[PDB]
Write a protein that holds these residues in place. Structure first.
Motif, mmCIF file in Angstrom:
data_model
loop_
_atom_site.group_PDB
_atom_site.id
_atom_site.type_symbol
_atom_site.label_atom_id
_atom_site.label_comp_id
_atom_site.label_asym_id
_atom_site.label_seq_id
_atom_site.Cartn_x
_atom_site.Cartn_y
_atom_site.Cartn_z
ATOM 1 N N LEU F 100 0.820 -1.202 0.000
ATOM 2 C CA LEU F 100 0.000 0.000 0.000
ATOM 3 C C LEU F 100 0.856 1.254 0.000
ATOM 4 O O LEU F 100 0.587 2.189 -0.759
ATOM 5 N N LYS F 101 1.900 1.288 0.823
ATOM 6 C CA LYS F 101 2.735 2.475 0.930
ATOM 7 C C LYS F 101 3.744 2.606 -0.203
ATOM 8 O O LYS F 101 4.491 3.587 -0.232
ATOM 9 N N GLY F 102 3.786 1.667 -1.141
ATOM 10 C CA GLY F 102 4.715 1.758 -2.245
ATOM 11 C C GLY F 102 6.150 1.440 -1.912
ATOM 12 O O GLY F 102 7.031 1.719 -2.732
ATOM 13 N N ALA F 103 6.421 0.890 -0.733
ATOM 14 C CA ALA F 103 7.780 0.535 -0.368
ATOM 15 C C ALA F 103 8.226 -0.709 -1.123
ATOM 16 O O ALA F 103 7.410 -1.523 -1.561
ATOM 17 N N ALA F 104 9.536 -0.834 -1.291
ATOM 18 C CA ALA F 104 10.108 -2.009 -1.931
ATOM 19 C C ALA F 104 9.987 -3.232 -1.032
ATOM 20 O O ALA F 104 10.084 -3.137 0.194
ATOM 21 N N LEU F 105 9.774 -4.393 -1.657
ATOM 22 C CA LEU F 105 9.572 -5.645 -0.933
ATOM 23 C C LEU F 105 10.839 -6.190 -0.293
ATOM 24 O O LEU F 105 10.754 -7.150 0.473
ATOM 25 N N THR F 106 12.009 -5.647 -0.608
ATOM 26 C CA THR F 106 13.207 -6.040 0.115
ATOM 27 C C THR F 106 13.290 -5.435 1.510
ATOM 28 O O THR F 106 14.186 -5.808 2.269
ATOM 29 N N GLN F 107 12.433 -4.470 1.851
ATOM 30 C CA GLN F 107 12.431 -3.925 3.200
ATOM 31 C C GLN F 107 11.700 -4.785 4.219
ATOM 32 O O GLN F 107 11.941 -4.607 5.416
ATOM 33 N N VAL F 108 10.813 -5.688 3.786
ATOM 34 C CA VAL F 108 9.943 -6.382 4.736
ATOM 35 C C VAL F 108 10.710 -7.431 5.551
ATOM 36 O O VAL F 108 10.486 -7.565 6.759
ATOM 37 N N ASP F 109 11.626 -8.180 4.931
ATOM 38 C CA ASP F 109 12.406 -9.138 5.703
ATOM 39 C C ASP F 109 13.484 -8.471 6.542
ATOM 40 O O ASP F 109 13.938 -9.068 7.519
ATOM 41 N N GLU F 110 13.898 -7.255 6.198
ATOM 42 C CA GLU F 110 14.910 -6.563 6.979
ATOM 43 C C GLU F 110 14.314 -5.531 7.922
ATOM 44 O O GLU F 110 15.060 -4.779 8.549
ATOM 45 N N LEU F 111 12.991 -5.473 8.028
ATOM 46 C CA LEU F 111 12.357 -4.728 9.104
ATOM 47 C C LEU F 111 11.820 -5.634 10.193
ATOM 48 O O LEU F 111 11.714 -5.207 11.344
#
Ligand SMILES: [Cu+2]
Ligand SMILES: [Mg+2]
Ligand SMILES: [Zn+2]
Lengths: 248, 151, 308, 392, 267, 307
Positions: F100-111
């Motif tokens: 939804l927020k347009g963030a890249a999917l590589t941020q989800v495992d590193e958050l």
């Protein structure tokens, strides 16, 4: 006695439930609306009222007390109440008195308004039989409700969440009203060589909805054993609920 | 043992009395000639004024599932006007003859036998056909009674 | 006379010991703090003090008796965390229900609704109450009767910033009367001004017990002295570093002194003798910093640059 | 056995017409000559209790106004009150009072006999196995039995193999069977009234006959019993309040193949109509099933249309509407459920009959028509009573 | 698109609801059980009016079980106020929930009427396979539309209320009123007036109930007997064709979604 | 200049629940909003997020409009209590917010490894504590490099090691150039980490500025206590020569309430005679400063134990 001080809470908390007062209004209307179409169209209408009060008095009892124990554990007051000078027996027995007098009043508005439509719209009802056939009806409808009240304490004390308590209270209401007799009909019409039909008047005693109708339809057994078998369904299931409530 | 004990009471057949009404037509059974069927149920014995009125009762769907023994008379060992109570054979293993001119009580005349040659005796002596119990159906009872008491 | 005498209990569930060798003695008017992180020891110790559990390898002596006598629990308040009362009942009727159970007099219900400040929202349903409005109700049932021991498990969650400081003024009025209470919180600044003696406990054991002056003395932790323009930043960075203290080199006009509190008695004489003390802030090693140290004393390797 | 000429008959007219005066007599009597004998109202011909009291052997005798009393009771020797021989053709038995323990009017082999206006009180103490018949008819062709009053006999008006005869307007009270029929091809009976009877109308093996306008008030356990009747006609019968004593059936159709059953009125019984499995596909249209606790008992799975020419029956529990203003209803009416035949097929379901699961299963049939067994429905039922005149 | 990114959540949130998967398998095991009795009785117009009666009780039930807590279950859960601080609108988090919950009903009836067809093509020998695909093609693309009506009904009663315990009471009220109360008030209006209240207005009252417009669509071809319809026999007096009955079913969505959006716009 | 609220006096129902707040927030500062009686605390929260319309005034977030989608990808909002979706997993909830927020999917495992939730990742949110949901609620707030955090009580229901590490994670984001708003009601503990406080009460923004400024604009006694003093009897009187009442409550607990006008000579009294061990200059904290500004607007001091 602190069994009454916790009973006065459940009277004040149960009577302000909008879910309960919606059903008790629909129970009191439909007990009049069946009796209206039972007079213009008295043992012939007290049997159709017995099938009505077998639908809703388990449903009223399971609406009150499915969240009696686990609804207080989710609210956090159950851990608070055990630190008071109170046993676990006095909490359960006091909730049973408090929820018990609610549906002991819900048949006095339920059948108290149904007998008003019978004693004043038949004109020749012979009311000396009425106060014995409804005294046998209002007392036995509370005892049917007190079984499912004690069933509701069993399923509330077993579960750990309020959402799975309503999933079991629906499961108890389906099994004891309209699954146990439908699997008796399927054991009749599909099995006759290995299903003794003489055993079937004793297999009705494993169902408190079935014992409820048998003391409103007056059979190898007498009436007084069915009163002692309906009270035995209260006494084992409350003792079962006390055994479950001591293992939290 | 429960099925055998219940069998151990149903098997015996009660003798007919003068005060015996039929189960269907309700009139007095022993005022008539011909064999008289009866049905022992082990919860209550019900009797019939004729064997054709018993087979009309047996082919109803209330009594297809009913485990009850059917008993008729042996007309090979009895006089046809006054049948006794001594020999009363099982009705499933009998040989009913049909189409005779004999005057039964209610339905068609179905003289019951047990030896099949005396059943073949009455068939050639009146122009009838011997038939078993399992071939009896409701298309045959109404056809044979119309040929007996009709025209 | 000691209120809670936890005398060497060791509570286990199966083979695992969730609380091992806890040894407390709460005094007659002390405010003690049970703080725990990895362990479930904090929760189990709470239950052992109350009548909820039984010590599997020890004994507890609450008020000189067993914790499950009815004479004990008539003088024992307990506010649990995240409590939500019966929402169709009213606020006055809920306390009048709880006054009947504890045997408290019915003339104290209108006092305690006035005492916690719930007079305006009394005779309203509990469903139309806020989170902090229910904490005023949950505190008010603990003050029923004359309690001698209070277990406030997180009393100031969701509470207004006046009402939390007003709550601790009600605490110091209570402990002057002689009822020794127990704070059980997680926001460690705020409880540290009113806690009489901390009781920080690890996974199994009890790490440290004693007052804040005893925890700072045992655990050697450095003082966080921050100043702003005494004389000059670079002229004052040099002085503490030969004496064995860290001087942080900030941007401009700021002197941060992290001293080791062992030689700084006579070293502080020169800071007064050459400049004015007119804008300084000396910070003692707080209860938050002591609690982070005792997690490093047993377990719990430190998180990264910014991780947890 | 004395004769009628051995009395003292005073002749009113000289055409073999005699008149017995008032005064009692004794013994049996025999008619051998064609005498149209009348009687004064005080002619109490009281026999002694044995033999047939008034035996008739001569043709064309108009017996009128006699009062017979206390004849025999041997039914095997047929001790009647009025025995009529086969040679006694065209006898008229008019307006007589009879009281005695045997047959009232026993006729056999006669033609055109007229049994008119008599009042035959049978018995009180005999066990309804030796009371004798009220009006026994044994293989007669041409008879006319009209407007009698038979009370407390055994099996009322028994009729055995009698072909063509009318039974018009006679009241039959407190007997075992009202009208008994045995092999009576091409019969007829009109406007009879039957009261307090263990079976109102026995119709056994009699074909091609007309049953019209009859009334049955408060009979026991069988309103009209029809066994093996073909090509019959049941038009205008009023069957009311068949109480138990069977559970009480207003009409019991047993192995009757073809008959037209129209314009009847089956009222206030326990069962309105019992249709056996052997008796199917006959024209049943226009009746009134009012006040019965259960309308049709039909233990089958075969469909059975009950409306010829698009007109059905009036049903009291028909909760339907009629939008287009004709006489017919708009929705069809099934009188029986699937659980309404589980009670008949298995009597152990009577314990479960008040259960909510049975009340659930009544609602599942109205929503899911796949589980509906093909029953005894009628398209286009009536909205109003067609038998507005039969209540009198 | 943002409308699809919130549809992928609800497609993965309804499929983990154990209460859905129980009563959507109940729709599959009853549509086999109804079609098995329809094969043993051969019958054809009775297994069509009973399958449409099965989806009258269950396709509103699965729709109201999904979406009664769609807005108010997110509002009191805190995750609705967060969602408006994302790059979205209120029109995208409602139409996205309608697409996301709509494909669940598109799978709950493709399982139900899909396995019902295999209990006919493998059970009754010699059935018309062209007529079978046409009859169950009309059952599939009209039981979704009945499901999408009560999906859009549930968004009306979720945006209006502010408590999930009161939303479940109202969703039970909507399921009782439209399914088996509107069929009984209309019956009692015809019985107690003996069909003489209004001889022309009363067939138009069937269009005020989308469960009855659903029954009127599938009972077009297989009228059969007279007692198979019951209270649906007034549909012969309706002068509208079958295509208007599709459009009156689509108009029950579009008014009850624009009402659901205008309520949610001033939440 | 991240949040520029100017002239806003929000009215609804003709009640005027907010009045004339001019709240400029710097591009690296950590502001704090604390509200008690006034409803300004929640209305101003909404006003910056853009889900409310400012009647009679303008809100300028990041120099642009508050309801633009181009600035709403650069915000992060941790709400009060968010039980998110109890049947979804931990990754599936955060991948939903990443789409939804347009963030890249590589941020989800590193958050989910930046926040301490990788051990409880791929587990359903109904099996999460309240502290783990606050950990997950922070994880969607740091989604796709936000230039403006906005936290509504981020440290409630949270254990103190993660609480101390949260402010270290906040201190990483302050150096990166992201303005953070810490709206809380648990005011002791947030005063060490914010740069400027903003106490607003009864609608009107009463006081704004840094903690050194709010003590200058409010005469409050500084509480110097020297725990572990050698001698105590002359220390009862030797501070009162310049008007500092040396009142104590224990054997040595002399919490000397000074006047902030003689800070040289009282320590020359302290260090000229007698040796200290650990001096405790107790500044008037954010709890004490709050009840002055609250009392200055509408509040009257409550009684002895009467709240
Ligand atoms: Cu007969
Ligand atoms: Mg109509
Ligand atoms: Zn018979």
């Amino acid at each position: 006695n602190q069994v009454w001080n916790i009973a006065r809470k459940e009277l004040s908390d149960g009577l302000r439930n909008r879910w309960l007062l919606a059903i008790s209004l629909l129970f009191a209307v439909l007990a009049v609306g069946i009796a209206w179409l039972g007079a213009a169209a008295i043992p012939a209408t007290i049997a159709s009222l017995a099938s009505l009060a077998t639908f809703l008095m388990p449903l009223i009892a399971l609406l009150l007390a499915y969240d009696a124990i686990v609804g207080e554990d989710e609210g956090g007051t159950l851990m608070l109440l055990l630190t008071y000078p109170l046993g676990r027996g006095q909490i359960l027995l006091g909730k049973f008195v408090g929820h018990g007098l609610i549906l002991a009043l819900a048949v006095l508005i339920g059948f108290g308004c149904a007998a008003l439509a019978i004693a004043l719209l038949v004109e020749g009802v012979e009311l000396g039989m009425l106060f014995w056939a409804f005294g046998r009806f209002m007392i036995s409808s509370t005892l049917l409700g007190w079984v499912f009240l004690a069933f509701a304490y069993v399923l509330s004390g077993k579960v750990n969440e309020k959402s799975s308590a309503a999933g079991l209270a629906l499961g108890v209401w389906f099994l004891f009203v309209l699954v146990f007799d439908l699997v008796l009909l399927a054991l009749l019409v599909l099995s006759e060589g290995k299903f003794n039909p003489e055993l079937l008047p004793w297999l009705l005693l494993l169902n408190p909805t079935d014992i409820y109708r048998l003391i409103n339809l007056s059979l190898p057994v007498p009436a007084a054993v069915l009163w002692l078998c309906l009270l035995a369904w209260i006494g084992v299931s409350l003792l079962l609920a006390y055994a479950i409530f001591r293992r939290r | 043992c429960g099925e055998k004990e219940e069998v151990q009471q149903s098997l015996e057949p009660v003798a007919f009395h003068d005060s015996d009404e039929c189960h269907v037509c309700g009139m007095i059974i022993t005022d008539f000639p011909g064999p008289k069927g009866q049905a022992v149920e082990k919860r209550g014995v019900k009797k019939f004024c004729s064997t054709a009125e018993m087979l009309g009762w047996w082919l109803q769907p209330e009594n297809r599932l009913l485990d009850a023994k059917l008993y008729v008379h042996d007309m090979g060992r009895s006089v046809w006007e006054k049948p006794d109570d001594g020999h009363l054979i099982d009705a499933t293993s009998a040989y009913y003859v049909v189409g005779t001119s004999l005057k039964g009580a209610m339905g068609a005349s179905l003289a019951s036998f047990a030896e099949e040659q005396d059943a073949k005796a009455l068939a050639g002596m009146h122009g009838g056909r011997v038939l078993r119990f399992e071939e009896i159906d409701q298309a045959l009872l109404q056809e044979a009674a119309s040929m007996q008491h009709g025209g | 006379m000691n209120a809670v005498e936890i005398q060497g209990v060791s509570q286990r569930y199966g083979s695992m010991t969730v609380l091992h060798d806890l040894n407390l003695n709460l005094g007659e008017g002390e405010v003690l703090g049970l703080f725990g992180h990895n362990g479930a020891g904090k929760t189990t110790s709470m239950k052992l003090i109350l009548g909820l559990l039984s010590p599997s390898e020890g004994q507890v002596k609450v008020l000189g008796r067993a914790p499950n006598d009815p004479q004990v629990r008539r003088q024992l308040g307990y506010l649990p965390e995240n409590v939500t009362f019966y929402p169709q009942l009213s606020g006055r009727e809920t306390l009048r229900h709880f006054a009947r159970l504890k045997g408290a007099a019915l003339t104290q219900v209108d006092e305690l609704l006035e005492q916690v400040g719930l007079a305006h929202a009394a005779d309203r349903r509990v469903k139309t109450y806020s989170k902090g409005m229910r904490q005023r109700l949950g505190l008010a049932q603990a003050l029923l009767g004359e309690p001698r021991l209070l277990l406030l498990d997180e009393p100031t969650v969701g509470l207004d910033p006046i009402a939390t400081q007003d709550l601790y003024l009600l605490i110091d009025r209570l402990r002057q009367r002689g009822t020794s209470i127990i704070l059980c919180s997680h926001v460690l600044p705020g409880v540290e001004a009113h806690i009489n003696r901390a009781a920080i406990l690890a996974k199994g054991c009890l790490q440290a017990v004693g007052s804040l002056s005893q925890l700072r003395a045992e655990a050697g932790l450095p003082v966080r002295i921050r100043a702003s323009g005494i004389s000059e930043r670079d002229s004052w960075l040099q002085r503490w570093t030969d004496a064995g203290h860290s001087a942080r080199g900030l941007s401009e006009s700021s002197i941060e002194v992290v001293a080791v509190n062992g030689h700084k008695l006579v070293l502080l004489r020169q800071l007064l003798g050459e400049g004015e003390p007119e804008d300084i802030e000396i910070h003692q090693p707080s209860l938050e910093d002591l609690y982070r140290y005792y997690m490093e004393r047993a377990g719990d390797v430190r998180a990264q640059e910014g991780r947890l | 056995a004395p004769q009628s000429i051995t009395t003292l008959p005073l002749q009113p007219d000289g055409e073999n017409r005699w008149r017995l005066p008032a005064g009692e007599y004794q013994g049996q009597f025999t008619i051998e000559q064609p005498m149209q004998l009348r009687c004064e109202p005080g002619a109490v011909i009281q026999s002694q209790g044995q033999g047939s009291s008034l035996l008739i052997s001569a043709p064309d005798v108009l017996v009128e106004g006699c009062t017979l009393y206390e004849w025999g009771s041997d039914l095997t020797a047929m001790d009647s009150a009025v025995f009529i021989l086969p040679a006694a053709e065209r006898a008229q038995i008019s307006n007589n009072r009879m009281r005695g323990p045997g047959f009232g009017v026993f006729v056999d082999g006669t033609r055109d006999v007229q049994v008119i206006g008599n009042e035959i009180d049978g018995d009180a103490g005999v066990r309804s196995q030796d009371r004798g018949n009220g009006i026994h008819l044994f293989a007669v062709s041409g008879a006319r039995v009209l407007h009698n009053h038979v009370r407390n006999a055994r099996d009322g008006i028994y009729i055995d193999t009698s072909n063509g005869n009318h039974l018009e307007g006679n009241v039959i009270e407190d007997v075992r069977y009202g009208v008994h029929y045995m092999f009576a091809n091409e019969n007829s009976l009109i406007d009879n009234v039957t009261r307090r009877t263990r079976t109102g109308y026995a119709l056994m093996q009699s074909r091609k006959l007309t049953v019209t306008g009859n009334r049955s008030e408060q009979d026991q356990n069988y309103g009209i019993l029809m066994n093996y009747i073909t090509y019959s006609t049941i038009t205008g019968n009023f069957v009311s309040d068949v109480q138990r004593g069977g559970e009480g059936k207003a009409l019991f159709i047993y192995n009757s193949l073809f008959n037209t059953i129209e314009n009847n009125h089956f009222e206030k019984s326990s069962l309105g109509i019992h249709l056996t499995a052997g008796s199917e596909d006959n024209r049943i249209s226009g009746n009134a099933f009012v006040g019965n606790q259960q309308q049709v008992k039909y233990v089958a799975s075969r469909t059975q249309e009950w409306s010829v020419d698009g007109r059905g029956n009036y049903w009291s529990d028909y909760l339907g509407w009629d939008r287009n203003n004709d006489g017919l209803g708009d929705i069809a009416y099934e009188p029986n459920d699937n659980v309404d035949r589980l009670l008949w097929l298995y009597p152990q379901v009577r314990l479960l009959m008040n259960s909510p699961s049975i009340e659930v299963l009544r609602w599942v049939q109205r929503a899911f028509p796949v589980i509906k067994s093909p029953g005894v429905q009628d398209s286009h039922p009536l909205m109003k009573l067609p038998t507005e005149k039969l209540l009198t």
